[PDB]
């Protein structure tokens, strides 16, 4: 899946993330390299495919894809979102 | 192109013990183990191997995000600074 990060926010207010708002505050590589603490920003949104996650939800999804070269099961993702999404 | 990642619950980084190949692999986390317990990511004993080096989760997290989101690892000088801030 395509993956990107942005500081648009809106997840904790359960706001729908629009492509336009996401892109207006997308984080570039150099920007993240200059300030890696961005990973802890409350407004950080992670785009994974068509969905938008907070970092706490995206982290296991992402860790699994790189460590095992395949996504987690569908039932696992549902459980992570249930546990971790705002 | 991206470096390989493995995870283990061998621990030892925060006591500054040397991470041995045997200790890492004997307690390596498998796909089904992580799929059954994704909270392992918060386990205090989690060690993340990135290429040749061993990190705790707090250090590995930005490395992992940069690789996935930008499809390239962070610069080496950046990783060194993350280590100073986040390694135990
Ligand atoms: Cl912000
Ligand atoms: Cl379903
Ligand atoms: Cl279902
Ligand atoms: Cl979870
Ligand atoms: Cl949980
Ligand atoms: Cl240990
Ligand atoms: Cl534990
Ligand atoms: Cl445990
Ligand atoms: Cl443990
Ligand atoms: Cl120390
Ligand atoms: Cl210490
Ligand atoms: Zn902020
Ligand atoms: Zn389902
Ligand atoms: Zn959980
Ligand atoms: Zn100890
Ligand atoms: Zn444990
Ligand atoms: Zn250096
Ligand atoms: Zn820092
Ligand atoms: Zn220490």
Author numbering:
A (entry chain B): 463 to 548
B (entry chain A): 461 to 548
Kindly provide excerpts from the paper associated with this entry.
Lipins are magnesium-dependent phosphatidic acid phosphatases (PAPs) that catalyze the dephosphorylation of the membrane lipid phosphatidic acid (PA) to produce diacylglycerol (DAG). Our principal findings are that the M-Lip domain is a new protein fold that forms a dimer, binds membranes, and can affect lipin PAP activity, oligomerization, subcellular localization, and adipogenesis. Phospholipid synthesis and fat storage as triglycerides are regulated by lipin phosphatidic acid phosphatases (PAPs), whose enzymatic PAP function requires association with cellular membranes.
We, therefore, truncated the M-Lip domain of mouse lipin 1 to remove the C-terminal cluster of hydrophobic and basic residues implicated in membrane binding by HDX-MS. We refer to this construct as the M-Lipxtal domain. The structure of the M-Lipxtal domain of mouse lipin 1 was determined to resolutions of 1.5 Å and 1.9 Å in two unique space groups. Phases were obtained using single-wavelength anomalous diffraction from selenomethionine (SeMet)-derivatized protein. The M-Lip domain of mouse lipin 1 and lipin 2 formed a symmetric or near symmetric dimer in all three crystal forms with a root mean square deviation for all atoms ranging between 0.36–0.77 Å. The observation of near identical dimers in three different crystal structures strongly suggested the native quaternary structure of the M-Lip domain as dimeric. Analysis of the dimer interface of the M-Lip revealed an extensive network of interactions between the two subunits with residues within the α3 helix, which was located in the center of the dimer, mediating the majority of these interactions. SEC-MALS reported a MW of 25.6 ± 0.6 kDa for the mouse lipin 1 M-Lipxtal domain, which was consistent with the MW of 26 kDa for a M-Lipxtal dimer.
